[PDB]
Amino acid sequence: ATVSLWETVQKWREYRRQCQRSLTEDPPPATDLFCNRTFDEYACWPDGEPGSFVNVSCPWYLPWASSVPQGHVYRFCTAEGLWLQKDNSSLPWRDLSECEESSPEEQLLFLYIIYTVGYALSFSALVIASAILLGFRHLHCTRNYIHLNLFASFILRALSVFIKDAALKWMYSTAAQQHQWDGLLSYQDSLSCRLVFLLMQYCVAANYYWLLVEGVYLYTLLAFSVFSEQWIFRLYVSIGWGVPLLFVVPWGIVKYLYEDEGCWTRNSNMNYWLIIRLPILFAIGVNFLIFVRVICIVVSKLKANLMCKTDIKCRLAKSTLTLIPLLGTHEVIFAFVMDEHARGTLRFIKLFTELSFTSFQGLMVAILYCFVNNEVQLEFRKSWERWRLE
Numbered sequence: 001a002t003v004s005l006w007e008t009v010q011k012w013r014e015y016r017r018q019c020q021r022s023l024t025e026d027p028p029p030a031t032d033l034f035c036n037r038t039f040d041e042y043a044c045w046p047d048g049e050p051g052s053f054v055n056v057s058c059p060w061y062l063p064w065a066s067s068v069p070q071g072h073v074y075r076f077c078t079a080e081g082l083w084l085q086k087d088n089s090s091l092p093w094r095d096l097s098e099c100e101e102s103s104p105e106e107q108l109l110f111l112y113i114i115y116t117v118g119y120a121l122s123f124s125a126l127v128i129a130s131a132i133l134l135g136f137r138h139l140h141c142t143r144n145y146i147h148l149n150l151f152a153s154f155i156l157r158a159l160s161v162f163i164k165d166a167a168l169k170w171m172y173s174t175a176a177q178q179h180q181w182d183g184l185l186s187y188q189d190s191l192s193c194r195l196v197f198l199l200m201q202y203c204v205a206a207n208y209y210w211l212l213v214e215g216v217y218l219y220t221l222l223a224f225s226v227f228s229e230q231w232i233f234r235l236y237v238s239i240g241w242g243v244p245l246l247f248v249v250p251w252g253i254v255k256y257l258y259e260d261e262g263c264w265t266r267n268s269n270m271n272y273w274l275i276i277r278l279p280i281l282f283a284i285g286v287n288f289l290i291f292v293r294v295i296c297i298v299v300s301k302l303k304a305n306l307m308c309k310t311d312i313k314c315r316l317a318k319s320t321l322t323l324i325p326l327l328g329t330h331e332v333i334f335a336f337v338m339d340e341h342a343r344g345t346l347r348f349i350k351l352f353t354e355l356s357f358t359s360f361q362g363l364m365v366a367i368l369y370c371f372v373n374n375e376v377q378l379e380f381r382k383s384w385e386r387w388r389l390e
């Protein structure tokens with residue numbers, strides 16, 4: 001199994017709660033002059049009779065606490081009833097030598113750097129592409145409207161991941177000592193974390209639905225449904241931007257009401273998470289069906305003409321490589337390779353690898369459908385010919 005600082009802090013939470021409960025639930029000694037019990041971010045020492053040490057077993061939240069489960073952290077208090085002071089008047093003396101001791105933290109830090117650079121290339125490419133597709137009035141179709149909505153979806157997704165990773169600065173605090181673990185959990189179980197992480201869940205689902213809209217619109221062009229345009233366009237924008245709210249807010253309400261701690265991370269024994277991951281899988285499967293049907297149409301269309309041995313293969317390969325970015329069909333590979341029962345560091349390493357590869361779908365789309373496009377080059381040439389005369 002894989003453990004990291006995440007699991008250590010999660011165990012520390014339970015240890016602190018348990019020791020804090022036993023701190024008051026423990027009956028006080030009848031005699032006096034005793035040394036006062038406490039919990040000082042490392043272990044919960046009990047009352048100690050004066051003139052001798054206190055022998056607490058090694059805390060069990062430590063990653064190495066199982067190798068030697070008989071070491072004792074040693075502390076001494078004076079026979080007058082005072083914890084022994086260390087030199088230079090610091091925290092009371094305690095002996096720690098008994099129990100004491102690439103990695104997933106560095107791994108996660110590198111996957112994070114590649115993913116931020118990619119989502120930051122995709123953001124730049126798509127903002128320039130949206131500007132170009134909005135500037136010229138000759139590029140106003142309905143398919144271009146769908147493209148602009150898709151680009152807006154990608155930009156919103158890439159802006160949400162930056163807000164999650166710079167709200168909580170986990171990329172500096174991955175080497176935190178004991179005295180900072182309260183400030184991590186305190187921020188975790190707050191409301192700002194919950195809302196910043198629920199916004200990300202909606203911006204991730206809108207992005208899959210605006211790729212189901214692309215697929216369905218292409219299919220309805222090729223399956224000859226020429227229904228009333230205004231009804232069709234309003235229906236498409238609706239299914240794009242407002243269907244997520246049909247499975248996000250039920251999840252966002254059950255998690256709010258029924259959970260006491262945490263920042264809406266996957267629950268241990270329950271399975272509340274299916275309200276978000278079930279429709280995403282549904283949309284991925286449907287878009288895969290649309291992809292295979294459209295390829296089945298294109299292959300016959302180019303088989304109908306007169307072509308050599310290698311030109312059909314070249315054209316089919318080029319068409320497929322052009323269509324995988326728009327319909328997001330690489331997700332079906334990613335959905336199979338992801339374990340949906342892993343929690344913690346295992347889950348955070350599987351998810352970040354997908355996000356490193358699927359972070360530059362937005363640059364790929366913006367370069368395939370706004371820069372190597374024929375008509376955009378044509379419009380640039382037309383505008384430069386006129387500006388030549390002044």
Ligand SMILES: N#Cc1ccc(COc2cccc(C3CCN(Cc4nc5ccc(C(=O)O)cc5n4C[C@@H]4CCO4)CC3)n2)c(F)c1
Nearest residue numbers: 004005006009170173174184185188197263265266345348
């Ligand atoms: N308590 C606590 C604590 C413990 C350790 C550290 C620092 O060390 C370590 C070690 C391993 C991994 C990590 C980071 C790994 C990930 N991020 C934040 C984060 N991105 C997420 C994306 C998707 C999901 C998901 O479920 O889909 C959930 C996501 N989560 C976890 C929670 C959920 C909102 O944020 C949290 C930390 N950090 C600390 F900063 C805080």
